[PDB]
Every structure is written in C-alpha cells, then in structure tokens.
C-alpha cells in the first residue's frame, strides 16, 4: 500500500533533520536510503497551476506499506503545499523541539492541518539530546496535548514519541536515537489507518462534455475521480441546476463499451431520459445522496503573494472573484469575518464564500481563485452551509 506523510512544526525545530532520520533508519533492510541532509534541504521549486512551492518529496517503504514523505523549507511553502494539495497527507508528524515547543508556527500549523483536513497527527519531539531534564519535557508534552485538543484533534490519546534526529543520523542506539525513530515508524505503521482508495470512495465524476447519440440517449464525458459506474447504477446530477435523477445505461470509451467506469480514467457514460440541454459542464455525477450542492461555504484560503504571480492588491470583504471547481468557474463573493477587513497578500485565513449558483461540494474539496486568468489565491472547503 501507499501512504502520504509529512513533518510539520516550527522552523529550526528539525523537520528536515528528522525526515533524513526516518530515511536513514528505514534504510535498514534497504526499505529506504541513507539520505543526506543537504539534498533534502535543497527542495526543488515547481510552479504548478500558477502556484510555486518548495517541496522535498522523500520516499521510503516499510514491511507494512510504502510512504510518501513531504518536507518544506518554510512556513509559506508548508501553507502552499497543504492548501494546493500537491499530495494530501493523511498523517502528519508534528515535530516539536524539546525546548520552546509551542511556537506560533506550530500554533498555525496545527490549525492549518485541521482546516485542510488532515485526519491524524502523530507527535514526535526532538532536541531531547539538548535537554537534560524530565519535568519540562512533561510540561511540553502537556502543552502539545492541550494544543491538539484545542483544535478537535485527540491529544489525550495522541501517540507522543521522544528522540533526537541528530543521534538517529549518528547511529547511536541510545533510546533518543534509532530506538526513537523505530517506534515512530511503528506508530506510523499502526496508528495511521490505510487510506481509502479512489475506486473505493463513493462514485463521483465531474461532467466535462455533453453529447447525444441517436438511439442511446445523453452521453456526458469526464474523468471519474472516485468509485465505479456500471450499467444499471442509479446516479444523480448535482451542480448548477437542481438535482436531477437518472440511470446509467452504458459506459463507453472510444466508441466501444466498457464493463464499468473506474476512478482515474476518462470514460464516458450514458444517461437514461435526460436531454442534451438538461445537463451541462460543471455539474457532477454522483451516487444519490453522496454529495449536495451549496452556495455558502467557509474555506481556508491562501492569498498568493506577488512572488508566485499572485496579485498586487489585498483581498477585502465584498471582493467577488471567480472560483474554479474541477470543471467550471463560478463567481463567488468573499465574505470575511469580524475584525478581518484587510487580508494581506501572502497570508492565509478562513473566509465565507457565496457563489452565484450552487456547486456540488463537500468538506475537503479544493479550488482556485482567479481573475482574468491570473491565480490570486488557492483554497480548500472547510464547511458547507445552506
């Protein structure tokens, strides 16, 4: 199996050093590779979807499953990676320095994980080799537990493991080194449940092109991004218009029928009864009741600074840009909260959005904010309202 993980926390707390530590320790039994610190600290920059991110993509595997490990060399890089969702992390290794643990970077990182929808956080504290005492370590543990509880995370039942990344790289068998990274791997292999597959999720398929075939009905094309669609499956059309019922009467690709339409492939699907003008690009096909349309929602929005292309001017309440949801752009009006009138570029906060017409969304969906074709920010849905 495959799982995506990453180290979050305050700068200088040893996230990169710890990532190298797991790399080298997983290199035992050749599962990983002895990884140099500098190579991973030199994260390449990719300007994907008009957004530039420094991310170091570390990879390694265990007898349990393979891990995709994510590291960023700065707070802006971490925020961009979470919100643009280059690789959704279903598990986060909160790196806490044994001294000065709960810094504001960790403060905002935990909240960002909560908003973007990271389901599980595993706490690891490093720099224990610089700390000779025990009761301040316990105080730091209590602080991080309380902070996790403060943002809907378990906290009390959150596994906390203690060690030192420098000792792990050195090779010392002292409990704060290799043994520490070894348990940390154990919690990674046990506490983190196996993530759901795309083909195992509920069926969903955004509609990109609407056809019609004589004798067959209405054909809508698009890449199925979850579940499976088969002839005889009851499906519903959700999006711009009000939800309509239909039934699958055929799945075809290149004018040839398929046994079923699986997630990840650009299959076309036939609809029963629906007309060529009763459905349009932007709507999605979903299992009945799996998703619902909404115009008002609250999202974690990162405003691109001018350095990423971005935008010269700040966001403000009443700004109404275009919002892009997987196949379509829709005008939404930015609605800030009390005490947020000005929203500086390069920052990230939670805003409410009111779309001009409903879009099939649910918590965790990601979208781009643009005007004139220039990306001015990225976002992720954190709550939907009616």
């Amino acid at each position: 199996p495959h799982v995506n993980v990453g180290t979050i926390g305050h700068v200088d707390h040893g996230k990169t050093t710890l990532t190298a530590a797991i790399a080298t320790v997983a290199a035992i039994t050749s599962g990983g590779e002895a990884k140099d610190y500098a190579s991973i600290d030199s994260a390449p920059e990719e300007k994907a979807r008009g957004i530039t991110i420094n991310t170091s993509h570390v990879e390694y595997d265990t007898p349990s499953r393979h891990y995709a490990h994510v590291d960023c060399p700065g707070h802006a890089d971490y925020v961009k990676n979470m919100i643009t969702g280059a690789a959704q992390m279903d598990g986060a290794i909160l790196v806490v320095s044994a001294t000065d643990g709960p810094m504001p970077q960790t403060r905002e990182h935990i909240l960002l994980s909560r908003q973007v929808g990271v389901p599980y956080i595993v706490v690891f504290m490093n720099k224990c080799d610089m700390v000779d005492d025990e009761e301040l370590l316990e105080l730091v543990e209590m602080e991080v537990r309380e902070l996790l509880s403060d943002y809907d995370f378990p906290g009390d039942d959150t596994p906390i493991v203690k060690g030192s990344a420098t000792e792990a790289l050195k090779g010392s068998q002292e409990k704060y080194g290799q043994p520490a990274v070894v348990e940390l791997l154990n919690i990674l292999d046990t506490y983190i449940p196996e993530p759901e597959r795309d083909i195992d999720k509920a069926f969903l398929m955004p509609i990109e092109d609407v056809f019609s075939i004589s004798g067959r009905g209405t054909v809508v094309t698009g890449r199925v991004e979850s579940g499976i669609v088969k002839v005889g499956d009851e499906i519903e059309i959700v999006g711009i218009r009000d939800t309509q019922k239909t039934t699958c009467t055929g799945v075809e690709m290149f004018r040839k029928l398929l046994d079923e339409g699986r997630a990840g492939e650009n299959c076309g699907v036939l609809l029963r009864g629906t007309k060529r003008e009763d459905v349009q690009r932007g709507q999605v096909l979903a299992k009945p009741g799996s998703i619902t349309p909404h115009t008002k929602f609250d999202a974690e929005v990162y405003v691109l600074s001018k350095e990423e292309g971005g935008r010269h001017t700040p966001f403000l309440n009443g700004y109404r840009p275009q919002f892009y949801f997987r196949t379509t752009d829709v005008t939404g009006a930015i609605q800030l909260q009390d005490g947020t009138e000005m929203v500086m570029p390069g920052d990230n906060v939670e805003m409410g959005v009111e779309l001009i017409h409903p879009i099939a969304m649910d918590k965790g969906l990601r979208f781009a904010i643009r005007e004139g074709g220039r990306t001015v920010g990225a976002g992720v849905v954190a709550n939907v309202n009616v």
Binding site: T99, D100, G101, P102, V131, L136, L139, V140, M142, E143
Partner: peptide, 25 residues
C-alpha cells in the same frame, strides 16, 4: 507554576526552558 511559566513566556518571547528557569530562579 505552569500558568506562571506560560505568562512569562508570552510576556518575554523566550523559550519554554528559559521561561521555566527564570520562573524557578
């Protein structure tokens, strides 16, 4: 003790260990 240490840390912007050392001193 924990509350005093937290207040001192918030007031002086120092680390947890430094704040605790100042509080216990």
């Amino acid at each position: 003790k924990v509350g005093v240490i937290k207040a001192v840390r918030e007031a002086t912007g120092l680390g947890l260990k430094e704040a605790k050392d100042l509080v216990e001193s």
